[PDB]
């Protein structure tokens, strides 16, 4: 109940990764397209924690 900014940033990135991955796996014809787009956005989101 005392998550830091980095802890919350990672948790949202995992949620974003799963969410966006499913989004572009449906949109694209392959699951890899979701993995790439979901991974890149989550990595970009988790690498920029506001502080």
Ligand X SMILES: COC1=C(OC)C(=O)C(C/C=C(\C)CC/C=C(\C)CC/C=C(\C)CC/C=C(\C)CC/C=C(\C)CC/C=C(\C)CC/C=C(\C)CC/C=C(\C)CC/C=C(\C)CCC=C(C)C)=C(C)C1=O
SS3 state of residue 19: helix
39 near another protein (CB under 8 A):
no
12 contact, one of ligand X, another protein, none, CB 5-8 Å limit per kind: another protein
Please give the residue ranges that form the binding site for ligand X (CB under 6 A).
6, 13, 17, 36, 39-40, 42-43, 46-47, 49
DSSP string, the chain: ----HHHHHHHHHHHHHHHHHHHHHHHSSSHHHHHHHHHHHHHHHHT----
Residues near another protein, by CB under 8 A? 8, 12, 15-16, 19-20, 22-24, 26-30, 32, 37, 41, 44, 47-48, 50
């Amino acid at each position: 109940p005392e998550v830091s900014e980095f802890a919350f940033r990672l948790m949202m990135a995992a949620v974003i990764f799963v969410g966006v991955g499913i989004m572009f796996a449906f949109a694209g014809g392959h699951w890899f397209v979701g993995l790439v787009v979901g991974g890149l956005v989550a990595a970009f989101f988790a690498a920029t924690p506001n502080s």
